[PDB]
Amino acid sequence: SEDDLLQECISSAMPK
Amino acid sequence: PPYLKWAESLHSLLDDQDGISLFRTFLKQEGCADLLDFWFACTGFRKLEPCDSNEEKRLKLARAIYRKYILDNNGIVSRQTKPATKSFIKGCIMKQLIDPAMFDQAQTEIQATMEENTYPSFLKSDIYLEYT
C-alpha cells in the first residue's frame, strides 16, 4: 500500500 | 563492547542502531533484508494505539504490511510464515478487525527464522568480523 508508509512505521520502532 | 553484546542475543543486536545497520547490510547482500524490515514493521504497528483518531492510519498500515510481506506467497517473509498464520492475518485485514497484536505470531516466526539461519551466519560473516 506504500513503501513510504512502511518506512515511517519501521523508523518509529528503531532504538533511541 | 557493543559488538560483543550482539553475539549474545538477537535482541541485543536489534537494540543497537549500529548493529541493525550492519545486520541489514548483511541481509541485503544475502537478498533477505525483508526479514528485518518486517520485524520492525510489526513492532511499529503494534505500538500504535487502537483509538478512533488512529483507525484510518492503522488500517492503511496493516494493509501495507500485508500487501508487501504477506500477500504474494513468493516473498521471503511469506515463504517463512505458516499458512494458518497468514490465513488469520488475511482475515483480520478483510474484516477490518486489526488488533495491535495481529502480526505477533508472524513476527515470532520471522524472528525464529533469523535466529535459525541469518543471525548465526551474520556473526560468522566478513562484515561482522571486519567490524570487530
Curated annotation (Swiss-Prot), chain A:
It comes from the Eukaryota. Expressed in a variety of tissues: brain, small intestine, colon, thymus, skeletal muscle, heart, prostate, lung, spleen, ovary, testis kidney, placenta, blood and liver. Isoform 1A: Very strongly expressed in brain but has relatively low expression levels in other tissues. Isoform 1B: Predominant form in all tissues except for brain, including gastric mucosa and blood. It is found in: Cell junction, Adherens junction; Cytoplasm, Cytoskeleton; Cell projection, Lamellipodium; Cell projection, Ruffle membrane. Phosphorylated; phosphorylation enhances the F-actin bundling activity. Phosphorylated by GSK3B. Residues 2-16 are annotated as: Interaction with AXIN1. Belongs to the adenomatous polyposis coli (APC) family. APC mutations have led to some interesting observations. (1) the great majority of the mutations found to date would result in truncation of the APC product. (2) almost all the mutations have occurred within the first half of the coding sequence, and somatic mutations in colorectal tumors are further clustered in a particular region, called MCR (mutation cluster region). (3) most identified point mutations in the APC gene are transitions from cytosine to other nucleotides. (4) the location of germline mutations tends to correlate with the number of colorectal polyps in FAP1 patients. Forms homooligomers. Found in a complex consisting of ARHGEF4, APC and CTNNB1. Found in a complex composed of MACF1, APC, AXIN1, CTNNB1 and GSK3B. The complex composed, at least, of APC, CTNNB1 and GSK3B interacts with JPT1; the interaction requires the inactive form of GSK3B (phosphorylated at 'Ser-9'). Interacts with APC2. Interacts with DLG1 (via PDZ domains) and DLG3 (via PDZ domains). Interacts with alpha- and beta-catenins. Interacts with AXIN1 (via RGS domain). Interacts with ARHGEF4 (via N-terminus). It is linked to Familial adenomatous polyposis 1: An autosomal dominant cancer predisposition syndrome characterized by adenomatous polyps of the colon and rectum, but also of upper gastrointestinal tract (ampullary, duodenal and gastric adenomas). This is a viciously premalignant disease with one or more polyps progressing through dysplasia to malignancy in untreated gene carriers with a median age at diagnosis of 40 years. Desmoid disease, hereditary: An autosomal dominant disease characterized by multifocal fibromatosis of the abdominal wall and mesentery. Desmoid tumors can also affect paraspinal muscles, breast, occiput, arms, and lower ribs. This is Adenomatous polyposis coli protein.
UniProtKB/Swiss-Prot annotation, chain B:
This is Axin-1. It is found in: Cytoplasm; Nucleus; Membrane; Cell membrane. It is linked to Hepatocellular carcinoma: A primary malignant neoplasm of epithelial liver cells. The major risk factors for HCC are chronic hepatitis B virus (HBV) infection, chronic hepatitis C virus (HCV) infection, prolonged dietary aflatoxin exposure, alcoholic cirrhosis, and cirrhosis due to other causes. It comes from Homo sapiens. The gene is AXIN1. Ubiquitously expressed. Component of the beta-catenin destruction complex required for regulating CTNNB1 levels through phosphorylation and ubiquitination, and modulating Wnt-signaling. Controls dorsoventral patterning via two opposing effects; down-regulates CTNNB1 to inhibit the Wnt signaling pathway and ventralize embryos, but also dorsalizes embryos by activating a Wnt-independent JNK signaling pathway. In Wnt signaling, probably facilitates the phosphorylation of CTNNB1 and APC by GSK3B. Likely to function as a tumor suppressor. Residues 9-132 form the RGS domain. Phosphorylation and dephosphorylation of AXIN1 regulates assembly and function of the beta-catenin complex. Phosphorylated by CK1 and GSK3B. Dephosphorylated by PPP1CA and PPP2CA. Phosphorylation by CK1 enhances binding of GSK3B to AXIN1. Homodimer. Interacts with ZBED3; the interaction is direct, enhanced by protein kinase GSK3B and casein kinase CSNK1E activities and decreases GSK3B-induced beta-catenin serine and threonine phosphorylations. Component of the beta-catenin destruction complex, containing at least, CTNNB1, an axin and GSK3B, that regulates CTNNB1 protein levels through phosphorylation and ubiquitination. Interacts with CTNNB1 (via the armadillo repeats 2-7). Interacts with GSK3B; the interaction hyperphosphorylates CTNNB1 leading to its ubiquitination and destruction. Component of the AXIN1-HIPK2-TP53 complex. The tankyrase-binding motif (also named TBD) is required for interaction with tankyrase TNKS and TNKS2.
